[PDB]
Amino acid sequence: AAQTNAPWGLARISSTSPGTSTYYYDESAGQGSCVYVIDTGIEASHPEFEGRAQMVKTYYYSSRDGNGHGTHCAGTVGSRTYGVAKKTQLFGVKVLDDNGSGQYSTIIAGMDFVASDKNNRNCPKGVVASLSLGGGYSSSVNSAAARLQSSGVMVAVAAGNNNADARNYSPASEPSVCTVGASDRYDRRSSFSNYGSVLDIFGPGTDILSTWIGGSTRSISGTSMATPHVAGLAAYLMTLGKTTAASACRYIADTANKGDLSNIPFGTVNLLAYNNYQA
Ligand SMILES: [Ca+2]
Ligand SMILES: [Ca+2]
């Protein structure tokens, strides 16, 4: 399949070079996979989700996404126009309030919820979790992310937007999950993107157009935007049977565009998520 005039991030993950406009992907498009978006919620009614999104858990008064961040991330995972895995099933877990903030105890609970809730869903091609959140280092947050990964979920987490070593941030610093840095349309590390040995992969993160609340769209930047690119790619590859939840991050790194990025500090992987699609 080919989506013309796609968001640059989608085109980038289906190209060996930057500057393309078409997103080439296999028509399976993550069908049969499931991606839990652990964030501010998802505006499931957005036409861009085509009924494939639903809220499954909220830790606040409402399951409504009153912020937009979670809806944006979910859109990059699997919205029709802005998603990597355009046929995946999206499950919203609202651990962040409508200001985009959340207590670590609630974020931990949301991870534990997904690890259990997945056993009640039909996700034959596997389960992915996109965690476009994080704060300071927390062994308990890291352990929760490790538990979620160990339970059989492909966990993708944002590296953080501190332009610093992700070792000091969680769940970014959890080794067992897929820690995602951000790049821009010119194959530079996003000026805000965290770095360091714990990063597994980079994804498009600067000026990422996706869904937004109120049935709208907007372009925002962050490692929160690169993470769903990798989560959606994992779902896409798992549907293709090329990898599993336990190995998806290693597979994405193994098959990534290598050495394409600039402004990558020594010791940080120079790997950009790439779907290796061949028509
Ligand atoms: Ca290249
Ligand atoms: Ca890792």
Swiss-Prot record:
Keywords: Calcium, Disulfide bond, Hydrolase, Metal-binding, Protease, Serine protease, Signal, Zymogen. Residues 7-279 form the Peptidase S8 domain. GO terms for molecular function: metal ion binding; serine-type endopeptidase activity. It is an enzyme of class 3 (hydrolase). Ca(2+) 2 binds at T16, D260. Hydrolyzes keratin at aromatic and hydrophobic residues. This is Proteinase K. It comes from Parengyodontium album (Tritirachium album). The gene is PROK.
